[PDB]
Amino acid sequence: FVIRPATAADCSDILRLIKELARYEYMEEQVILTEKDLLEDGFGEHPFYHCLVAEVPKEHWTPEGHSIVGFAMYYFTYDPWIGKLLYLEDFFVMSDYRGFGIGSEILKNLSQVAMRCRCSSMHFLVAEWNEPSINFYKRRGASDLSSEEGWRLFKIDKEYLLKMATE
Amino acid sequence: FVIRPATAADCSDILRLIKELARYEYMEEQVILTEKDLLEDGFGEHPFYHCLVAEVPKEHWTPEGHSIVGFAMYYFTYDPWIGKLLYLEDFFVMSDYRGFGIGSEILKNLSQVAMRCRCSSMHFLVAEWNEPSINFYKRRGASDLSSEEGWRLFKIDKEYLLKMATE
Numbered sequence: 164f165v166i167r168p169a170t171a172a173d174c175s176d177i178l179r180l181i182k183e184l185a186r187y188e189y190m191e192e193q194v195i196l197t198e199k200d201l202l203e204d205g206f207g208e209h210p211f212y213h214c215l216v217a218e219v220p221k222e223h224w225t226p227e228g229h230s231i232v233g234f235a236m237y238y239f240t241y242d243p244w245i246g247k248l249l250y251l252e253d254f255f256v257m258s259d260y261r262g263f264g265i266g267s268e269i270l271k272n273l274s275q276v277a278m279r280c281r282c283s284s285m286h287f288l289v290a291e292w293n294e295p296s297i298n299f300y301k302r303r304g305a306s307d308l309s310s311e312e313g314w315r316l317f318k319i320d321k322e323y324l325l326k327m328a329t330e
Numbered sequence: 331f332v333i334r335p336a337t338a339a340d341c342s343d344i345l346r347l348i349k350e351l352a353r354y355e356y357m358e359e360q361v362i363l364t365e366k367d368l369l370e371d372g373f374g375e376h377p378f379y380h381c382l383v384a385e386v387p388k389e390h391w392t393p394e395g396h397s398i399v400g401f402a403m404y405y406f407t408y409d410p411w412i413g414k415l416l417y418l419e420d421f422f423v424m425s426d427y428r429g430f431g432i433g434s435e436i437l438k439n440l441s442q443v444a445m446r447c448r449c450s451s452m453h454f455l456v457a458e459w460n461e462p463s464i465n466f467y468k469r470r471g472a473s474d475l476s477s478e479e480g481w482r483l484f485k486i487d488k489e490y491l492l493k494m495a496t497e
């Protein structure tokens with residue numbers, strides 16, 4: 164297999180993989196992003212996300228005829244105390260393509276991206292019940308991050324943003 | 331007062347305000363970012379953060395002779411399901427300058443930044459004990475975000491990133 168940065172041509176594949184992840188998590192209807200959205204947010208002159216994809220030889224394409232079987236979606240964030248961070252948002256490999264070393268390689272690639280960018284750390288969320296992924300991550304140096312407890316996460320949606328913006 | 335985007339010249343002020351926030355939270359020693367860090371991460375050819383600052387007339391400078399009395403540090407993030415988000419990382423106004431409407435104006439500015447960028451929402455963390463800030467935010471449309479529970483936040487620090495990067 165090959166792990167490479169995505170191209171505008173892979174947007175179709177990214178949306179498909181994003182939907183597989185959502186379905187794996189039983190929330191597929193939650194995905195309202197469109198292919199057009201990804202192309203614009205990801206390959207426009209200013210990307211709001213970066214993506215790595217795992218491509219397999221055409222001989223081993225998915226039954227649907229897809230060469231892309233995995234991806235990692237990330238962006239850089241900032242911590243006023245320590246600086247640059249690489250934030251891994253989504254990470255998924257299609258069932259039939261797991262346990263082959265694709266995910267490990269994607270993580271290796273991300274780690275290089277992090278060092279090249281001089282990020283001091285990579286952060287990410289893992290569902291509490293997902294022992295397999297927790298083990299995967301902790302076998303590769305991951306540790307628990309306690310910076311968020313004692314804190315509440317809030318959101319201000321578009322309706323109120325617009326109101327505030329125009330008061 | 332004036333709310334404006336920061337300039338490379340304000341880095342000194344940003345670091346000072348970042349340290350006041352840390353001290354307000356009793357963690358000032360945690361700030362290891364340098365002025366040089368901010369200049370590079372914030373005004374280099376690619377910013378890892380954006381900042382708004384509140385400037386007051388020289389007549390009302392701080393005892394230390396500073397015109398900058400508040401700031402907001404943010405960056406854009408991405409949610410594979412809904413797209414672009416504006417993430418507010420740090421938000422602080424010096425004690426003697428609060429209750430004047432500076433914070434409200436900063437939030438108004440951020441909301442416009444969010445709409446201009448077509449973000450569907452603005453996310454941010456508030457310490458659980460901080461009822462004053464919770465009220466401030468909820469009076470302006472904020473609501474609780476439940477997307478993170480049932481999830482654990484992990485980190486992979488530089489040591490392991492480098493190892494993985496070079497295995």
Ligand SMILES: CC(=O)SCCNC(=O)CCNC(=O)[C@H](O)C(C)(C)COP(=O)(O)OP(=O)(O)OC[C@H]1O[C@@H](n2cnc3c(N)ncnc32)[C@H](O)[C@@H]1OP(=O)(O)O
Binds near residue numbers: 257260
């Ligand atoms: C920030 C986040 O978004 S975290 C959410 C991550 N995603 C998920 O949990 C969704 C479901 N899971 C997946 O999509 C995948 O399993 C991933 C992305 C977690 C991992 O990717 P994969 O390609 O399956 O795994 P990879 O093949 O590198 O596997 C490493 C594990 O497989 C085994 N393995 C790796 N290569 C091989 C191989 N060639 N032969 C046999 N076994 C192998 C290893 O023993 C390793 O085990 P460990 O985790 O106990 O150390």
Ligand SMILES: CC(=O)SCCNC(=O)CCNC(=O)[C@H](O)C(C)(C)COP(=O)(O)OP(=O)(O)OC[C@H]1O[C@@H](n2cnc3c(N)ncnc32)[C@H](O)[C@@H]1OP(=O)(O)O
Binds near residue numbers: 354454456
């Ligand atoms: C993502 C995060 O980082 S959240 C962490 C936010 N930070 C903190 O909690 C640190 C400590 N607090 C602060 O630094 C500040 O208080 C901030 C940033 C939270 C708010 O900024 P400020 O400039 O103080 O507030 P501002 O003056 O706009 O005040 C709005 C409140 O003050 C009152 N107020 C505003 N303008 C005036 C005025 N001209 N005259 C009298 N009262 C006023 C309002 O009643 C309003 O009350 P409400 O919150 O109950 O609605």
